[PDB]
Amino acid sequence: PVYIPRPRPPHPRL
Amino acid sequence: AVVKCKPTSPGRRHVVKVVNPELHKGKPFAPLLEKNSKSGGRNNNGRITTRHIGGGHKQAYRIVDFKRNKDGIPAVVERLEYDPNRSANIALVLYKDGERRYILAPKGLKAGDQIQSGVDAAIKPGNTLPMRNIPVGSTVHNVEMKPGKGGQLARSAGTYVQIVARDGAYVTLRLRSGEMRKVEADCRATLGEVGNAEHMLRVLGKAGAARWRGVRPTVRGTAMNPVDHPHGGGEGRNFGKHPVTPWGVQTKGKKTRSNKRTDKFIVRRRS
Amino acid sequence: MKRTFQPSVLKRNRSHGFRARMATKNGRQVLARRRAKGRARLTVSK
Amino acid sequence: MIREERLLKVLRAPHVSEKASTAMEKSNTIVLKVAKDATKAEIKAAVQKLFEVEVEVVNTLVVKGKVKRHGQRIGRRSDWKKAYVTLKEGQNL
RNA sequence: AGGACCGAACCGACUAAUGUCGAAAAAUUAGCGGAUGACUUGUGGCUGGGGGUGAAAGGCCAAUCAAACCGGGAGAUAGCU
RNA sequence: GCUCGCCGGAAGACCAAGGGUUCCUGUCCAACGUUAAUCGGGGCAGGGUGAGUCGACCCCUAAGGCGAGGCCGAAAGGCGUAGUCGAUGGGAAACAGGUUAAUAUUCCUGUACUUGGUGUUACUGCGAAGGGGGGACGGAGAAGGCUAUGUUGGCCGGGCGACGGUUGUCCCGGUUUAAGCGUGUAGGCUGGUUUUCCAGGCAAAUCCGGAAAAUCAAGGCUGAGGCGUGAUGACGAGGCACUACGGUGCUGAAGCAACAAAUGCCCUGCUUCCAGGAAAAGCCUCUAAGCAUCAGGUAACAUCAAAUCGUACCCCAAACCGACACAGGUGGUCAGGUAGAGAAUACCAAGGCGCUUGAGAGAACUCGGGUGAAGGAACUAGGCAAAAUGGUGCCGUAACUUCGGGAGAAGGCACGCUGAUAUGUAGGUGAGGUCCCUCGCGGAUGGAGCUGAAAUCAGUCGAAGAUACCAGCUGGCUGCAACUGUUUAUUAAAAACACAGCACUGUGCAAACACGAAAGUGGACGUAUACGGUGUGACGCCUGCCCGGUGCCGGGAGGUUAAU
Ligand SMILES: [Mg+2]
Ligand SMILES: [Mg+2]
Ligand SMILES: [Mg+2]
Ligand SMILES: [Mg+2]
Ligand SMILES: [Mg+2]
Ligand SMILES: [Mg+2]
Ligand SMILES: [Mg+2]
Ligand SMILES: [Mg+2]
Ligand SMILES: [Mg+2]
Ligand SMILES: [Mg+2]
Ligand SMILES: [Mg+2]
Ligand SMILES: [Mg+2]
Ligand SMILES: [Mg+2]
Ligand SMILES: [Mg+2]
Ligand SMILES: [Mg+2]
Ligand SMILES: [Mg+2]
Ligand SMILES: [Mg+2]
Ligand SMILES: [Mg+2]
Ligand SMILES: [Mg+2]
Ligand SMILES: [Mg+2]
Ligand SMILES: [Mg+2]
Ligand SMILES: [Mg+2]
Ligand SMILES: [Mg+2]
Ligand SMILES: [Mg+2]
Ligand SMILES: [Mg+2]
Ligand SMILES: [Mg+2]
Ligand SMILES: [Mg+2]
Ligand SMILES: [Mg+2]
Ligand SMILES: [Mg+2]
Ligand SMILES: [Mg+2]
Ligand SMILES: [Mg+2]
Ligand SMILES: [Mg+2]
Ligand SMILES: [Mg+2]
Ligand SMILES: [Mg+2]
Ligand SMILES: [Mg+2]
Ligand SMILES: [Mg+2]
Ligand SMILES: [Mg+2]
Ligand SMILES: [Mg+2]
Ligand SMILES: [Mg+2]
Ligand SMILES: [Mg+2]
Ligand SMILES: [Mg+2]
Ligand SMILES: [Mg+2]
Ligand SMILES: [Mg+2]
Ligand SMILES: [Mg+2]
Ligand SMILES: [Mg+2]
Ligand SMILES: [Mg+2]
Ligand SMILES: [Mg+2]
Ligand SMILES: [Mg+2]
Ligand SMILES: [Mg+2]
Ligand SMILES: [Mg+2]
Ligand SMILES: [Mg+2]
Ligand SMILES: [Mg+2]
Ligand SMILES: [Mg+2]
Ligand SMILES: [Mg+2]
Ligand SMILES: [Mg+2]
Ligand SMILES: [Mg+2]
Ligand SMILES: [Mg+2]
Ligand SMILES: [Mg+2]
Ligand SMILES: [Mg+2]
Ligand SMILES: [Mg+2]
Ligand SMILES: [Mg+2]
Ligand SMILES: [Mg+2]
Ligand SMILES: [Mg+2]
Ligand SMILES: [Mg+2]
Ligand SMILES: [Mg+2]
Ligand SMILES: [Mg+2]
Ligand SMILES: [Mg+2]
Ligand SMILES: [Mg+2]
Ligand SMILES: [Mg+2]
Ligand SMILES: [Mg+2]
Ligand SMILES: [Mg+2]
Ligand SMILES: [Mg+2]
Ligand SMILES: [Mg+2]
Ligand SMILES: [Mg+2]
Ligand SMILES: [Mg+2]
Ligand SMILES: [Mg+2]
Ligand SMILES: [Mg+2]
Ligand SMILES: [Mg+2]
Ligand SMILES: [Mg+2]
Ligand SMILES: [Mg+2]
Ligand SMILES: [Mg+2]
Ligand SMILES: [Mg+2]
Ligand SMILES: [Mg+2]
Ligand code: NA
């Protein structure tokens, strides 16, 4: 493709 | 008259209007009108060069006779008119030869008053003549800086210049700012103060009132990010800087006047 | 959802048309590059 | 005065169709495929000169060519001009 | 009269649910705010990258923004995988 | 084809933008269409877009662009004058009916109109890159007059009914007609006319502006709509015949009135307010040079011309922007009935659709809803969600307040239908008639007819009458922000930003300041009651002490100190 969506943010292991 | 609006709504509670019943409630004199398009504060290059300008009411330009060089011919004031381009009101004035002109309206001017310009005019208010035939100590307005240039000082509402001294080819003037300035005695000035001295008593009440005068909102430099202003940044209302302009120059007292070619004419600067 | 491409033939030709390209020195270098590349459609002019 | 060499270029063909047949039938209008330039005055002069009939008025329209897909290639037929020539009273000749 | 009030169009986007390989790369449904104004909208125009514009969030500038995109320097450099 | 359902301020109709043949006909069903497809916006072929009046083009200009020279700049180039482009604005003119499978204000029929050219005739001052007028302009509000339109009645044609009744104050349908031309109205604006004179309109001016005098008091300009004509025409419910049974042809009655009524028109009006509201041309007028026999102008009549390009089709959409036949987005115009305040809402009309997989079954669970014993926030972070409130009229309404508010505070009562008051009232409209006239679209009286709330009293039905849809929950204390507004397009709408107000400060105009190697431009065609910057942030009461540090302002004696 030409558009790759940003992956969903990870769980904030903070 | 200075009228306080009644608080029938917020934005109306604090309005104070300057309502003059003597102004013409009609269309202005069309031959003395021309187009005056807004700039938005944008210059030749299309860039905002002066900030906080934009919008406001459409307004036509009234050609006001500042030169006042129709000498000898008497003129009668036929109208006092609202001018969107000034804080002062204008006077539509008819000359004996059948010519109409707009002038600044002096303080006590009325419809039917006789004004005339020239070296031999009386010392009536509204009369224009070189500041060599005007007494010393007299209060004048629409003062020329150069002979024939037109008249650039004391043109705002309620403003006036005081002829303080007179030494040869020059006359010393106390300006509305408190500055003493030398001006050629062949420069014309109109007698009296500019009318509409209640203009500074208006309050505008609300933000839309300033918006329809063409004034766009002012963001404080503190309210910005460090990339936008020399102020700006901080974890909640931090300043710690000396106050400066958006371009880093100290405001809050730092003289920016640099002429060196007009210093000879400034007897004493304002205080 | 209004999208980014809102077509207008007048604005298209005034913005990227042949005469718009020819107006400037740099637009004429766009045409030279597209001529050197062999582009069938030189500008947005049809 | 349009020259005869130009009049002999103005007209290309008669347009045969049901609408053209009906026009000649019940309105005395002949339908022609004419040149692309083909002003109304040129068409009128050419019909009156070559067909030697009496022309009342000429209505013209441009027919845009159809995009056809011959094989696997995209082609376009040429635009052509169509003229509705109304003959005055007598008849075609 | 009014940056007045209630409330459609219109402009928004507060709550919840759904949806989350969606009908949709930002929605739908039910409610919600403004609704003569600092309003909204059409057409055209102008401002441009350390630049613009910003009722100011580092917001926006073609689904891209703490320095757009395209091409080039360019096979940058990479004691790292 | 008959039913059913859905939209109907659209899911109907017409456009612009954008698209570009998707339009219509025939044919085909591979692929495409989320299934089948005989169908299609698919394939193939053919057809289809007709203009003096619609639009573009054209004339004119806005923002803005370009820009001879010019000014500026290493070059590139920047700005800009004359000028020339640039619509989203100004500028001539066409309507109704009919017709195609597909276009129609373009074709046809009928009836118009406009601008030019060329002639003829007649009478004459014409003449501009120039002057003047005009074009020509805001918001809000109110009213009157109208119309579109609708309702009812009358009229005309048809009917007399599948289940009781239905020859009647019964049912169904129709009852249309334009531009143009004439009239000049409701209404708005304006005093006219003549003479003389003038330092103004870059020169002139007979025009405009100004002044004086006389004279008459009316004239002039604008103007919806109505009326007449257009039109013994067209259309027309239906009826009559034939089949391609799709339609084709023929004929054709009545074709009136009253009432209601726009957000449309008069109206670019009027009133009012401040925030004080394009330009230029067309147009009218005036003259200059110039030509005055000519040219030119004016007016009739005649003739000629009005080119070119667009016109199909979609256009809240399967045809545009979203990769899709995608629950998204997309400017304008038209907008009927019953109820309703309404463009809400419900049900309908015209019109258009049933959303391109169906058939079953009737588990959990999910989604979207309905109802629920007793309880009633015990839930939960939190009444999240839901439930609830909800209309109109009237009564009544606290603290506090900036005197406006709070407030729709809170609460409460009435509400359907029928009859009477009153064979429909108050009101509105308004015919005939009868006068009056300075006679017409006139005035006064007059009230037929039409329309018609609201209320009271009496009765009456239901569990319930604001019965559906629609449609505030309310109150108490408190922090923050005065308030309306703005913001992280796409997890933050906030106490953040803005704000009116306040203060400090700079700035004397070639202003400060900003964009620019510069020219120049903005500030501003402004001038200290102005403009910029900064902070604070309505209002009320206020804003105390510190100048040591850093900054800024002033001084300049002395010390130190660059190039030279
Ligand atoms: Mg400012
Ligand atoms: Mg401020
Ligand atoms: Mg601020
Ligand atoms: Mg902040
Ligand atoms: Mg911030
Ligand atoms: Mg900094
Ligand atoms: Mg800060
Ligand atoms: Mg901060
Ligand atoms: Mg802190
Ligand atoms: Mg600190
Ligand atoms: Mg563009
Ligand atoms: Mg014709
Ligand atoms: Mg044509
Ligand atoms: Mg409001
Ligand atoms: Mg909305
Ligand atoms: Mg927003
Ligand atoms: Mg929200
Ligand atoms: Mg509100
Ligand atoms: Mg509201
Ligand atoms: Mg735009
Ligand atoms: Mg931050
Ligand atoms: Mg983006
Ligand atoms: Mg960088
Ligand atoms: Mg790159
Ligand atoms: Mg290298
Ligand atoms: Mg590499
Ligand atoms: Mg095709
Ligand atoms: Mg089709
Ligand atoms: Mg077919
Ligand atoms: Mg098959
Ligand atoms: Mg299939
Ligand atoms: Mg097809
Ligand atoms: Mg311009
Ligand atoms: Mg230029
Ligand atoms: Mg040059
Ligand atoms: Mg032009
Ligand atoms: Mg236009
Ligand atoms: Mg054009
Ligand atoms: Mg059609
Ligand atoms: Mg001249
Ligand atoms: Mg009517
Ligand atoms: Mg009618
Ligand atoms: Mg009837
Ligand atoms: Mg019968
Ligand atoms: Mg029976
Ligand atoms: Mg009248
Ligand atoms: Mg309205
Ligand atoms: Mg002649
Ligand atoms: Mg004549
Ligand atoms: Mg069409
Ligand atoms: Mg169609
Ligand atoms: Mg589908
Ligand atoms: Mg769609
Ligand atoms: Mg409604
Ligand atoms: Mg509705
Ligand atoms: Mg179930
Ligand atoms: Mg329930
Ligand atoms: Mg229960
Ligand atoms: Mg029960
Ligand atoms: Mg119970
Ligand atoms: Mg309880
Ligand atoms: Mg609990
Ligand atoms: Mg618990
Ligand atoms: Mg919880
Ligand atoms: Mg809730
Ligand atoms: Mg609920
Ligand atoms: Mg009436
Ligand atoms: Mg009840
Ligand atoms: Mg509600
Ligand atoms: Mg607390
Ligand atoms: Mg507080
Ligand atoms: Mg707030
Ligand atoms: Mg508001
Ligand atoms: Mg915004
Ligand atoms: Mg967000
Ligand atoms: Mg967020
Ligand atoms: Mg949010
Ligand atoms: Mg904020
Ligand atoms: Mg603050
Ligand atoms: Mg505060
Ligand atoms: Mg203090
Ligand atoms: Mg000290
Ligand atoms: Mg010092
Ligand atoms: Na100090």
Author numbering:
A (entry chain v): 5 to 18
B (entry chain C): 1 to 271
C (entry chain 2): 1 to 46
D (entry chain T): 1 to 93
What does the paper say about this structure?
Rescue of ribosomes stalled on nonstop mRNAs is essential for most bacterial species, and for mitochondrial translation in humans. The rescue systems tmRNA-SmpB, ArfA, and ArfB release the truncated translation product, allowing the ribosomes to be recycled for subsequent rounds of translation. Among the rescue systems, only ArfB is able to induce polypeptide release independent of canonical termination factors. The globular N-terminal domain contains the conserved GGQ motif essential for catalysis of peptidyl-tRNA hydrolysis.
In order to understand how longer mRNAs affect ArfB-mediated rescue, we determined the cryo-EM structures of ArfB bound to P + 0 and P + 9 E. coli ribosome complexes. The cryo-EM particle images were sorted in silico for ArfB occupancy and ribosome conformation yielding cryo-EM maps for the major states of P + 0 and P + 9 complexes at 3.7 Å and 2.6 Å resolution, respectively. The two structures are virtually identical within the error of resolution and depict ArfB bound to the ribosome in the post-hydrolysis state with Api137 and deacylated tRNAPhe in the P site. The absence of mRNA density past the P-site codon in the P + 9 state suggests that ArfB has displaced the mRNA 3′ extension from the mRNA entry channel. The mRNA is intact under these conditions, indicating that the A site overhang must have become disordered to allow accommodation of ArfB into the mRNA entry channel. Because the post-hydrolysis state is structurally very similar with P + 0 and P + 9 mRNAs, in the following we generally refer to the 2.6 Å cryo-EM structure of the P + 9 complex as the major P/P post-hydrolysis state. The present 2.6 Å cryo-EM map shows how ArfB interacts with the ribosome in the post-hydrolysis complex. In agreement with mutational data, the cryo-EM-based model shows that the essential residues Arg105, Arg118, Leu119, Lys122, Lys129, and Arg132 form intricate side chain contacts with the ribosomal RNA (rRNA), whereas most nonessential side chains that are not involved in any interactions are less well-resolved. The essential positively charged amino acids interact via their guanidinium and ε-amino groups with negatively charged groups of 16S rRNA (and 23S rRNA for Arg105), whereas the hydrophobic Leu119 stacks with its isobutyl group onto the guanine of G530. In the PTC, Gln28 in the universally conserved catalytic GGQ motif of ArfB retains a conformation poised for peptidyl-tRNA hydrolysis, which is stabilized by interaction with Api137.
